[PDB]
Structure formats: structure tokens, C-alpha cells
Design a protein around this ligand. Structure first.
Ligand SMILES: CC(C)CCCCCCC[C@@H](C)CCC[C@@H](C)CCO[C@H](CO)COCC[C@@H](C)CCC[C@H](C)CCC[C@@H](C)CCCC(C)C
Ligand SMILES: CC(C)CCCCCCC[C@@H](C)CCC[C@@H](C)CCO[C@H](CO)COCC[C@@H](C)CCC[C@H](C)CCC[C@@H](C)CCCC(C)C
Ligand SMILES: CC(C)CCCCCCC[C@@H](C)CCC[C@@H](C)CCO[C@H](CO)COCC[C@@H](C)CCC[C@H](C)CCC[C@@H](C)CCCC(C)C
Ligand SMILES: CC(C)CCCCCCC[C@@H](C)CCC[C@@H](C)CCO[C@H](CO)COCC[C@@H](C)CCC[C@H](C)CCC[C@@H](C)CCCC(C)C
Ligand SMILES: CC(C)CCCCCCC[C@@H](C)CCC[C@@H](C)CCO[C@H](CO)COCC[C@@H](C)CCC[C@H](C)CCC[C@@H](C)CCCC(C)C
Ligand SMILES: CC(C)CCCCCCC[C@@H](C)CCC[C@@H](C)CCO[C@H](CO)COCC[C@@H](C)CCC[C@H](C)CCC[C@@H](C)CCCC(C)C
Ligand SMILES: CC(C)CCCCCCC[C@@H](C)CCC[C@@H](C)CCO[C@H](CO)COCC[C@@H](C)CCC[C@H](C)CCC[C@@H](C)CCCC(C)C
Ligand SMILES: CC(C)CCCCCCC[C@@H](C)CCC[C@@H](C)CCO[C@H](CO)COCC[C@@H](C)CCC[C@H](C)CCC[C@@H](C)CCCC(C)C
Ligand SMILES: CC(C)CCCCCCC[C@@H](C)CCC[C@@H](C)CCO[C@H](CO)COCC[C@@H](C)CCC[C@H](C)CCC[C@@H](C)CCCC(C)C
Ligand SMILES: CC(C)CCCCCCC[C@@H](C)CCC[C@@H](C)CCO[C@H](CO)COCC[C@@H](C)CCC[C@H](C)CCC[C@@H](C)CCCC(C)C
Ligand SMILES: CC(C)CCCCCCC[C@@H](C)CCC[C@@H](C)CCO[C@H](CO)COCC[C@@H](C)CCC[C@H](C)CCC[C@@H](C)CCCC(C)C
Ligand SMILES: CC(C)CCCCCCCCCCCC[C@@H](C)CCCCCCCC(C)C
Ligand SMILES: CC(C)CCCCCCCCCCCC[C@@H](C)CCCCCCCC(C)C
Ligand SMILES: CC(C)CCCCCCCCCCCC[C@@H](C)CCCCCCCC(C)C
Ligand SMILES: *C\C=C(C)/C=C/C=C(C)/C=C/C1=C(C)CCCC1(C)C
Ligand SMILES: *C\C=C(C)/C=C/C=C(C)/C=C/C1=C(C)CCCC1(C)C
Ligand SMILES: *C\C=C(C)/C=C/C=C(C)/C=C/C1=C(C)CCCC1(C)C
Lengths: 196, 196, 196
């Protein structure tokens, strides 16, 4: 079909489904309560991402916010997916370092302004302001990364970079490739980090 | 007024209000903490449903997604209501069988993709895809019903059936009756199951 | 710029940022888990409010729902902000009076219908119904204030008053001043109550 990045969306869908299937199959037997918590969180993330990728694939989680004299396609379902998977991720990270609820709520709270503000950046029609939201979102990311303190850092910090050179940002790489880099980013975070 | 199913919406509003009133009155005296938790959850569900039904009654939680060559009315407030009442319900079911947070989060997590995906099915303009979302939502329902394991099963499984023959699905029964069957479904789940 | 209340939005942004900065700086050193919980909640509220005020300032969290023969500007980001800050607030109040989860969920549950219904009132195009939602929202406020039982009462009860004489309600004071009174209201609740 006519949308260059459909194949990256299609690859994304496939890899998220499969990994869900995989963590689902792998969850059985888990009776240890704690272990069940880890498993449920690890299974749910790609599940969610699977439905989000399918919606973008299907062209539903996509919309054309105008800016820079341009009518631009924006996959708002990306943010929809990060809104729910990133705090769960942190839930997992919180069990590792065994973080208090105090730490947890600020971590999860900083996380929501993060994706909430990038989605606002995503959807603003006044190009100049997009980066203000981008910087406020990036500033919340560093809070999280900072309380969270080696691969989450590099993995999470790459989203703001691809956004910035992305076609939602400076516009340095076409959408077809920005989509590509997010997919690779989402699969490693949703599936590999869960595998790892 | 001109919308055939307004009376089913009106009946729905009335029954949700009344039952709220009822569980509200019945909650007083509850000092036992656990009991308070059961009461709060049972009171809140119809409360929410009361406001959702009123909005659809008032014609506000309604919208006309086009598909099948048709401009179709879709009560998106139904999903808005299920998004919040169904996990609370499960909260209650979780206390019965005393389910771990592990079990609880997957149960509540499976539940959100469930209504999230049906709402997407609800709102897609490409008729063919509606059922793909319908099946992904139904597949999450069975996870829940399956971890949840005799009346929740029959009650919950009826939503996907009415959706399917519903005017949001195959279109086998007109909207005026699909609304009817959901109301009967929602009241028994929101009020009777709470009573029961 | 051309929107009379921009300065109240600008003042609002500034005061929310500063107080965030302030509670952020003040949070450091906190190792006591409980104390961390109080600090995280107190820091997060103005953070959120800071981004909401900026969006309204930037004219993004604003929209023009028509009613009374009029095309009216409605700052939906106000509700977006209350949706998340008010339950956190109550989280704090819950720690003071040390409220059970039972009490907590009804408190937080009543709170969501509250802002959810006012936003519906905010957005209905049939002027008459706006107040029905207003009264249902106000009725949920009194539940909260009532379980919550001296300044939260007066502070929280003022939102429904300014709404009512506000330009989203009876229209007794122009928007430029309704915005003013909410800002003063939000800063004292978001920052002063946190300071206090
Ligand atoms: C706590 C602790 C911390 C709180 C964090 C604060 C977050 C700030 C978010 C604010 C901004 C939200 C914007 C969104 C509500 C509306 C954006 O739509 C724009 C006009 O509103 C236009 O694009 C609209 C066209 C399209 C819109 C895409 C919407 C997307 C929604 C993704 C959510 C999904 C779940 C929906 C319910 C199921
Ligand atoms: C923090 C401090 C920096 C705030 C000042 C900024 C620059 C203000 O200059 C004005 C234009 O002459 C913008 O006002 C307003 C006109 C425009 C509105 C933009 C206001 C924002 C720039 C205010 C700060 C939001 C951004 C900050 C980036 C996140 C940071 C707080 C981590
Ligand atoms: C997508 C690109 C192709 C990938 C390019 C990224 C290179 C990956 C860096 C390798 C990693 C190194 C971490 C190894 C660990 C060793 C730990 O050393 C320290 C012991 O005192 C603990 O963390 C010590 C801290 C050290 C590393 C901690 C986190 C890192 C910080 C990286 C920031 C991120 C930036 C995102 C890059 C974006 C442009 C892709
Ligand atoms: C704490 C601090 C306040 C951090 C806040 C950052 C504030 C953002 C300031 C950047 C803003 C002034 C840039 C305005 C874009 C400007 C080029 C407008 C574009 O002009 C043309 C309009 O027909 C379109 O060209 C299209 C131009 C595009 C090819 C590229 C647009 C510019 C880009 C800006 C990205 C800046 C990043 C480094 C993020 C800033 C940090
Ligand atoms: C966790 C764990 C699990 C996560 C589950 C994933 C859920 C997947 C949801 C995704 C799809 C969400 C769609 C919704 C955000 C936007 C749909 O609108 C469509 C374009 O976006 C068009 O119809 C728009 C016209 C009308 C739109 C109706 C919107 C409805 C919103 C109901 C939510 C209510 C609460 C709103 C905030 C108060
Ligand atoms: C699970 C496995 C089944 C996935 C394959 C499907 C059929 C794929 O055929 C292609 C059309 O020739 C659809 O690709 C894509 C074109 C269309 C997009 C639809 C993709 C979805 C069919 C992929 C699976 C989503 C549905 C699955 C129903 C839920 C199930 C996973 C419980
Ligand atoms: C809306 C229609 C008019 C209503 C038609 C539905 C008929 C209701 C079925 C009667 C119920 C029977 C359950 C009795 C209990 C006894 C338990 O037996 C087992 C002991 O080993 C435990 O559960 C044993 C499992 C057994 C039943 C468990 C759940 C049931 C499964 C039903 C699936 C649902 C399908 C929804 C039907 C839809 C078309 C309305
Ligand atoms: C539990 C326990 C208790 C549950 C409480 C029930 C709450 C009832 C809420 C219901 C009403 C929700 C309305 C909203 C989803 C959609 C309103 O938009 C209208 C048509 O839908 C038109 O204005 C649309 C133009 C603009 C719309 C502004 C939307 C605002 C959204 C604010 C949410 C933010 C977060 C978004 C995801 C990030
Ligand atoms: C509670 C009880 C009061 C409900 C009756 C109301 C008045 C009904 O009169 C009808 C117009 O002749 C409205 O029906 C429907 C036509 C219009 C729809 C409005 C229905 C609402 C008025 C029903 C009650 C919602 C409001 C109640 C305010 C909150 C209260 C329950 C705390
Ligand atoms: C914005 C306007 C300029 C401000 C005008 C509001 C005046 C402020 C009232 C002063 C306060 C008094 C509370 C003092 C405390 C003393 C406690 O006395 C009782 C001991 O039995 C405990 O609470 C006893 C209860 C007593 C007070 C409890 C809560 C109060 C109730 C006020 C309702 C609110 C209405 C909002 C007013 C709106 C129009 C601004
Ligand atoms: C438990 C109870 C059921 C509580 C529920 C409250 C139900 C609300 C009933 C109020 C409703 C009948 C008022 C209808 C407004 C009416 C003036 C319509 C306006 O007429 C003109 C139309 O061209 C516009 O004038 C513009 C008129 C505006 C200048 C003012 C509009 C009227 C205001 C109504 C506010 C009433 C408050 C006291 C809240 C009610 C409690
Ligand atoms: C991995 C095992 C043991 C079970 C199978 C899991 C099911 C899903 C298969 C896809 C998993 C993803 C690979 C993990 C690592 C990442 C960095 C993700 C890279 C994604 C891009 C695809 C490139 C192809 C691959 C060699 C995986
Ligand atoms: C029931 C008691 C003890 C208190 C009163 C509760 C307040 C609400 C009244 C409505 C309650 C609903 C009935 C419970 C059972 C269900 C299967 C729901 C069926 C709904 C349809 C209406 C048909 C009429 C009735 C005979 C209730
Ligand atoms: C207050 C201390 C110790 C630290 C500084 C906090 C950072 C933010 C500064 C603004 C704080 C707000 C004042 C608290 C009280 C309120 C009732 C809010 C009133 C808001 C309106 C502005 C009027 C100016 C002021 C005198 C604050
Ligand atoms: C899917 C799994 C993870 C960990 C996804 C993480 C996403 C982010 C950290 C995205 C961050 C953004 C920032 C910091 C700034 C621009 C907007 C984004 C939401 C892309
Ligand atoms: C209101 C109380 C309950 C238990 C409501 C339950 C609703 C569902 C189980 C709805 C399920 C759907 C599915 C499985 C598929 C189509 C979309 C629906 C959301 C209608
Ligand atoms: C920002 C901090 C707090 C405590 C904000 C509180 C807001 C309210 C209590 C708002 C209440 C409303 C009601 C009761 C009726 C009309 C709609 C409103 C949401 C404005």
C-alpha cells in the first residue's frame, strides 16, 4: 500500500505479536507471586504495542497535523503505546532495584508528563513550539533516567533523538525512516528488554 | 425525541442512578476496611455508568463513524464506561478468589486492551477491519474469563455477541435493539452483580 | 497577544514552573520512604499544572464549543490538569488522616467522575445540559469534601462557583476574569497547599 513505512509498521506488528505469544507461552507454570508480577508486566507491554502497531499499520492511529506550511502525518498511536508501556517497564525496573512507592510514583509520574508532553509536541501546529514541548519532555526523561541510576539510558535517550531528526522534529530524515528507527527501538524495548 | 433507543438510554440512566443511590445508602455504617473496599467498588461502578448513560441519552457520547457506504451512529460512551467499570469489577472478583497483584495486573491489563480494542473496532471506517479488532478484543476477553476460572462468563461473553450481531458489527439487529441488549447487560453487571 | 487572559495563563505557567523547581530542589535529601511519597506527590502536581498552563497559554489546550447562539472558547486543558492533580492531592490528604484504600478508592473514584462530568459540562453544546453536568459534578465534590471531614473545602468549593458565574456557566463574568480566578485557585492549591 501507498504508505512507504507500512512495511516497518507490518514488521512491527509481527514482532510484537510473536513476542507476546512467546511471553504468554513462557508465563505458564509461574505460580510464584512475585514472578507472576514480572511475567504479567513483561507479557502486557508487547501486547499493547502489538495493538498499537496494528492500528498504525491499519492507518487508524495516524493523523495529519499541519505545520511548516505542511500537512504532516503523525502517528499518534506511538504515544498511545508509550503512555501505557513505559510506566509498566519502570514497574519492572522498580522491582529490580526494589524502589519504594515514593520513588515509583515520581518515576511513573515523571513518565506521564514525558509522553504527554511529546504527544503535545507531536500535535502542535506552530512548529516553533513543538521543540519547547520536546525539551520539556526530554527534561522529564532525564529525571527518570537520573533516578534510574546502562541500556535503558541509551535505549530511552534514542527516542528523543529520532524525534528530533525525525519528521515530527527538525525533519532531517523522512518519515519512512523515522518509523523504521522507532520500530527497532520499540521492539528492543518491548521484546528484547523483556527477553533480556 | 427522534432517537429510537432514547428510551433504553433513559431506562438505563434511571436504573444506574437508583442503584447508585441504593449502594450509596447501603454503604453507610461500613467501618470494616475490607468491607469499605467492597462497598466503594460496588457503589462507583453504577455511578460511572449513570453518568455515561446520561451522556449517551443526552446525545453527547454519540458519534457517526462512516462505514459500509453508511454514516453510522456509534455510542462511544459505552466504551468510556467499560474502560472504567470493568477493571473495578475485576478488582471485586480479585478479592473473592483473593488474587495476587500479579494475577490482578494481567487481569486488569488484559481488560484495558479489550475495551481499548473494541473501541477501535467501534471507530474504524474500514468495515473489514472492525472484526479484526473485534477478534483481538474477544481474544483478550477469554484470557480474562480463563484466568477468572459462572455468571461473569455468560454475562461478559454476551457483550461480544451483541456487538457482533449489533449495528457496530454484522448489522443483524438494528441499533434500537442493540442498545436495548447492552442496557440490560450493563444494568445486570453494574447493579445486579453488585447486588448479587 | 490577542487573548485577554494570556497574561493570567502566563502568570500561571511561571508560578507553576517556579514552584515545581522549588519542590524539586526541596525534595533532595529525602531518604525516608514515606517522606519521599509526600515529596513526589507535592512536586508532581505543579509539574503537571505547569505543562497544562503552558498548553493553554500556547493556545493548544483551548477549543470553541458552541452554545447560547455563541462560539465559546473553552480551556479543556484545565480539566486535563484537574484529572491528574486532584486525585494526587487526595493521596496527600489520605496520608494525613491516614485513610484506608477503601476510603481512598471512593475518594479517588468520586474525584474522577467530578472532573470527568465537569469536562462534559464544559463541552456540551446544549446550554441547558451544561448545568445538569455541573450539578452532577458538584454533587461528587460534596461526597469528597464530606468524606474529607478546613481550607480544602473552601478552596475546592470555589471551583464550582467560578465555573457557574464563569463564561462556561451562567456567563456572569467574562472569560478574561474566569481565567484569572482559576489561576489564583490553581496556584494556591497546586503550590500553596503543597507549601502549607
Ligand atoms: C499524571 C501523574 C501525569 C499527567 C501527565 C500530563 C499529560 C499531558 C497531556 C495533555 C495533552 C493531551 C492531548 C490530548 C488529550 C488531546 C490532543 O488532541 C489535540 C486537541 O486536544 C488535537 O489532536 C487530536 C487528533 C488525534 C488525537 C490523538 C489522541 C491520543 C490519545 C492517546 C490516549 C489513548 C487512550 C484513550 C482512552 C482509551
Ligand atoms: C525554565 C525557565 C525558562 C523560561 C523562559 C523561556 C524563554 C521566555 O521567553 C519568552 C519569549 O520572549 C517566552 O515566553 C512565552 C512565549 C512562548 C511560550 C513558551 C514558554 C516556555 C518557554 C516556558 C518554559 C517552557 C520550556 C522549558 C523547557 C523545559 C525546562 C523547564 C526543563
Ligand atoms: C542507537 C545507536 C546506534 C547506539 C549508540 C549508543 C552506544 C551504546 C553505549 C554502550 C553502553 C555502555 C554502558 C556499559 C555499562 C558499563 C557500566 O559502567 C558504569 C560503571 O561505573 C555504570 O554505567 C556507566 C554509564 C555508561 C553508559 C550508561 C548509559 C549510556 C548513556 C548513553 C546515552 C544515550 C544516548 C542515546 C544515543 C542515541 C543517539 C542513539
Ligand atoms: C531549555 C530550552 C528553552 C530548550 C527549549 C528549545 C526551544 C526550541 C527553540 C527552537 C525554535 C526557535 C526553532 C524554530 C524553528 C524555525 C527554523 C522555524 C522554521 O522556519 C520555517 C517556517 O516557514 C520552516 O523551516 C523548517 C525548520 C526545520 C527544518 C527545523 C526547525 C528548527 C529545529 C529546532 C530544534 C531545536 C532542538 C535543538 C531542540 C531545542 C533544545
Ligand atoms: C494498559 C495496561 C493497557 C492499554 C490498552 C490499550 C488501549 C488501546 C486504545 C487505543 C485507541 C484509543 C482511541 C482514542 C484515543 C481516539 C479514537 O478517536 C478516533 C481517532 O483517534 C476517531 O474517533 C473519535 C471521535 C470520538 C472519540 C471517542 C473517544 C473515547 C474516549 C473514552 C475515554 C474517556 C476518558 C477521557 C479522559 C477523561
Ligand atoms: C495471529 C497470527 C494471524 C496473523 C495473520 C492474519 C492474516 C494475514 O493476512 C494478511 C492479508 O493477506 C493480513 O496482513 C495485514 C493486512 C491487514 C492487517 C491485519 C493484520 C492482523 C490480521 C494481524 C493479526 C491481528 C488479528 C488477530 C486476532 C487476535 C488474535 C491474535 C488472538
Ligand atoms: C443472554 C442469554 C439469554 C443467556 C443464555 C446463557 C445461558 C446461561 C448458562 C447457565 C449458567 C450455567 C452455570 C451453572 C454453574 C454450575 C457450575 O458448574 C461447574 C462445576 O464443575 C463450574 O462452572 C461450570 C461452567 C458452566 C458455565 C460457566 C460459564 C458459562 C459459559 C457461557 C458462555 C457465555 C456465552 C454468552 C452467551 C451469549 C450468546 C448471551
Ligand atoms: C473512574 C474510577 C471514574 C471514571 C470517571 C468518568 C469520567 C467521564 C468522562 C466521559 C467524558 C469524556 C469526554 C472525552 C473523552 C471526549 C470529549 O470530546 C467531545 C466529544 O467526545 C468533544 O470535545 C472534544 C474537543 C477537545 C476534547 C478535549 C479532551 C480532554 C481530554 C483530557 C484527557 C487528557 C489525557 C489524554 C491522554 C494522554
Ligand atoms: C436524581 C433524581 C432527579 C432526576 C429527575 C430530573 C428531572 C427529570 O425531568 C425530565 C424532564 O421533564 C428529565 O428527563 C430527561 C431529559 C433531560 C435529561 C436529564 C436527566 C437528568 C436530569 C437525570 C438526573 C441527572 C442530574 C442529577 C444531578 C446530580 C444528582 C444525582 C446528585
Ligand atoms: C474565595 C473567597 C474570597 C474566600 C471566602 C471563603 C471564606 C473562608 C472561610 C474561613 C475558613 C474557616 C475555617 C476555620 C477552621 C476552624 C475549624 O472549625 C471547626 C471546629 O469544629 C472545624 O472546621 C469547621 C468548618 C468551618 C469551615 C470548613 C470549610 C469551610 C466551608 C466553606 C465552603 C466553601 C465555599 C467556597 C466559597 C466560594 C464562593 C469562594
Ligand atoms: C439537582 C438539580 C436537578 C440540579 C440540576 C440543575 C439543572 C440545570 C437547570 C438550569 C437550566 C434550566 C437553565 C437553562 C438556561 C436558560 C436560561 C437557557 C438560556 O436562554 C437563552 C437561549 O438563547 C440563552 O441565555 C443565556 C442564559 C445564561 C445567562 C444563564 C443560563 C442559566 C444558568 C443556569 C444555572 C443554574 C445553576 C443554579 C445550577 C443549577 C443547580
Ligand atoms: C528470543 C527467544 C529466545 C524467543 C523468541 C521471541 C519472539 C520474538 C522474535 C523477535 C525478537 C526480537 C529480537 C531481540 C533483540 C532486539 C534488539 C530487537 C531487534 C529487532 C529487529 C529485527 C531483526 C531480526 C532479528 C535477528 C531478531
Ligand atoms: C434490589 C434491591 C434489594 C434494591 C434496589 C436496587 C436499585 C435498583 C433497581 C434496579 C435493579 C436491577 C434488577 C437486578 C437484576 C437484573 C438482571 C437487571 C435487570 C434490568 C432490567 C429491568 C427489569 C425490571 C426489574 C424487575 C428489575
Ligand atoms: C514560598 C517559599 C518558601 C518558596 C517559593 C515557592 C515558589 C513559588 C512562588 C509562588 C508561590 C505562591 C504563593 C503561595 C500562596 C498562594 C495563596 C498563591 C497566590 C498566587 C498569586 C500570586 C500573588 C503573589 C504572591 C505574594 C505569591
Ligand atoms: C517503548 C518503550 C520505551 C522505554 C519507550 C520510551 C519512549 C520515550 C523515552 C520517548 C520519549 C520522548 C521524549 C523524551 C521527547 C520527545 C517525545 C518522546 C515521547 C518521543
Ligand atoms: C459493564 C460490565 C462489564 C463486565 C462490561 C463488560 C464488557 C465487555 C466484556 C465487552 C467486550 C467487548 C468485546 C469482547 C469485543 C467487542 C468489543 C466489546 C468492548 C463490546
Ligand atoms: C487543582 C487542585 C484542585 C483541588 C482542583 C480542584 C477542582 C475542582 C474541585 C473542580 C470542580 C468542578 C466542579 C465541582 C463542578 C464544575 C466542574 C469543575 C470540574 C470546575
Amino acid at each position: 500500500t501507498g504508505r512507504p513505512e507500512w512495511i516497518w509498521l507490518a514488521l512491527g506488528t509481527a514482532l510484537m505479536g510473536l513476542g507476546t505469544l512467546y511471553f504468554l507461552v513462557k508465563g505458564m507454570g509461574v505460580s510464584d507471586p512475585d514472578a507472576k508480577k514480572f511475567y504479567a508486566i513483561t507479557t502486557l507491554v508487547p501486547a499493547i504495542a502489538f495493538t498499537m502497531y496494528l492500528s498504525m499499520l491499519l492507518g487508524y492511529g495516524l493523523t495529519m497535523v499541519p505545520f511548516g506550511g505542511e500537512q504532516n502525518p503523525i502517528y499518534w498511536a506511538r504515544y498511545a503505546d508509550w503512555l501505557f508501556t513505559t510506566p509498566l517497564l519502570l514497574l519492572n525496573l522498580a522491582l529490580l532495584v526494589d524502589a519504594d512507592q515514593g520513588t515509583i510514583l515520581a518515576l511513573v509520574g515523571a513518565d506521564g508528563i514525558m509522553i504527554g508532553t511529546g504527544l503535545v509536541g507531536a500535535l502542535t501546529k506552530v512548529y516553533s513550539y513543538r521543540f519547547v514541548w520536546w525539551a520539556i519532555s526530554t527534561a522529564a526523561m532525564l529525571y527518570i533516567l537520573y533516578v534510574l541510576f546502562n541500556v535503558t539510558v541509551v535505549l530511552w535517550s534514542a527516542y528523543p533523538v529520532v524525534w528530533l531528526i525525525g519528521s515530527e522534529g527538525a525533519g532531517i530524515v523522512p518519515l519512512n525512516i523515522e518509523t523504521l528507527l522507532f520500530m527497532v527501538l520499540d521492539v528492543s524495548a518491548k521484546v528484547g528488554f523483556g527477553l533480556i
